[PDB]
């Protein structure tokens, strides 16, 4: 139960210090029913070429880090064959298998909260005073694969408490216990299909709740890598490639 292997497509992930697997809302990704669908054109289900593990950028965990987030359909729109299909097709649909990995040693300590927040809408500080109706820039609402850093993690940059973020599919990475978190997310939206460009079904939040710490001499560079794989990907409404 502490060891596990995730194989999908032509990619395999290994781990010897896992903490089980979470299946968001107790549901596995699935394809769209014939009665839940509307688009009449036959969709493309590329399978193995898009349903595989993509490893996005690595972040560095510092004793003062606040946390980061990634919007999901988004992080992959410019990567591999998944990205190509997401650009050529109007409609997209899929679940995800997210595997956040971060290892240290038996002498390091700290705890990361890895959670999935559906429809993660970002807010602004409203000019500090709260009298200015400002809005988050494109660079912040859809940060891409590089993710974005939280400025006010306590309120998740959206006026909501992070202490309650656990009502969402989550898992923790407690260095003294495990070195990775695995969460499987089904397609969640009020529509059977939607644009992979304009809409971000959910956001991945990785936030340090218990600060990283260690004594001088132990390796100081502790990376946090994000690996994710689409599941049951379906695309429809073919046309030319659109970036945004």
């Amino acid at each position: 139960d502490r060891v596990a292997q995730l194989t999908i497509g032509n990619s395999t992930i290994t781990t010897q210090e896992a903490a089980n697997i979470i299946v968001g809302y107790g549901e596995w990704p699935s394809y769209c029913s014939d009665d839940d669908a509307t688009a009449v054109d036959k969709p493309t289900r590329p399978d193995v070429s898009v349903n595989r593990f993509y490893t996005l950028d690595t972040k560095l965990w510092e004793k003062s880090s606040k946390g980061w987030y990634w919007k999901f359909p988004d992080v992959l729109t410019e990567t591999g064959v998944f990205g190509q299909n997401a650009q050529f097709h109007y409609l997209y649909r899929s679940g995800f298998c997210i595997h956040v990995q971060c290892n240290a040693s038996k002498f390091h300590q700290g705890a990361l909260l890895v959670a999935i927040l559906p429809e993660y809408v970002i807010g602004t500080v409203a000019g500090g005073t709260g009298t200015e109706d400002s809005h988050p820039p494109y660079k912040q609402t859809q940060p891409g694969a590089d993710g974005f850093e939280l400025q006010h993690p306590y309120v998740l940059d959206a006026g909501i408490p992070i202490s309650q973020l656990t009502v969402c599919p989550h898992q923790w990475i407690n260095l003294r216990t495990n070195n990775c978190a695995t969460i499987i997310v089904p397609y969640m939206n009020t529509l059977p299909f939607d644009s992979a460009l304009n809409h971000c079904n959910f956001g991945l939040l990785v936030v340090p709740i218990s600060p990283l710490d260690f004594d001088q001499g132990a390796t100081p560079v502790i990376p946090i890598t994000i690996t994710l794989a689409p599941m049951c990907s379906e695309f429809a409404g073919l046309r030319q490639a659109v970036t945004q």
Partner: protein
């Protein structure tokens, strides 16, 4: 099927009857563009001349595949192949045939069977579409239709160098409408006496 006014250009008093058909003729052979129009049924444009477009005006939302039949009214000796293409949402008006052919299309060959049917399959993100207008509601656009010359309009000596095509449009068996409302236009200015 009712006549689709693809050639909704002439507004002259004497030229109204020519909006009912568009021209096709001998070209230079470089896959020239013939005509273009939005596939949106309840939107201002060509579809307003059809019964479908008129009935749509009475409903807020619709769903289903549409179909457009093109009838060639040239002479028996006239030959030719056209490429009618349907470009789903997001795809800007194809600049050339090589771009238009990447979407849903049909190569039409003129012959004994005068007409051909382009089916505009229901390819939407939402189950229903509200009427598309310029601006925000362009979210519900259906796409674009464009006729190109696959080869060329060929004819012998003695036969007209210009012929016309008549487009007829209607809905498929899976077409449905919901949420009654009043048509955008009221045919009255002052009290009716």
């Amino acid at each position: 099927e009712t006549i689709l006014e693809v050639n909704n250009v002439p507004t002259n008093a004497t030229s109204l009857m020519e909006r009912l058909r568009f021209p096709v003729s001998a070209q230079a052979g470089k896959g020239e563009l013939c005509a273009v129009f939005r596939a949106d049924p309840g939107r201002d444009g060509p579809w307003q001349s059809t019964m479908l477009g008129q009935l749509c005006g009475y409903y807020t939302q619709w769903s289903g595949s549409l179909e457009v039949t093109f009838m060639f009214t040239g002479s028996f000796m006239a030959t030719g192949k056209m490429l009618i293409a349907y470009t789903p949402p997001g795809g800007p008006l194809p600049k050339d045939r090589a771009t238009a052919m990447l979407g849903t299309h049909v190569i039409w060959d003129f012959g004994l069977q005068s007409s051909v049917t382009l089916v505009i399959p229901w390819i939407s993100n939402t189950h229903y579409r509200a009427h598309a207008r310029d601006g925000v509601f362009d979210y519900y656009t259906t796409g674009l239709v464009s006729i190109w010359y696959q080869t060329n309009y060929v004819v012998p000596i003695g036969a007209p160098n210009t012929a016309y095509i008549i487009a007829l449009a209607a809905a498929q068996k899976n077409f449905t409408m919901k949420l009654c409302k009043d048509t955008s236009h009221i045919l009255q200015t002052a009290s009716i006496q």
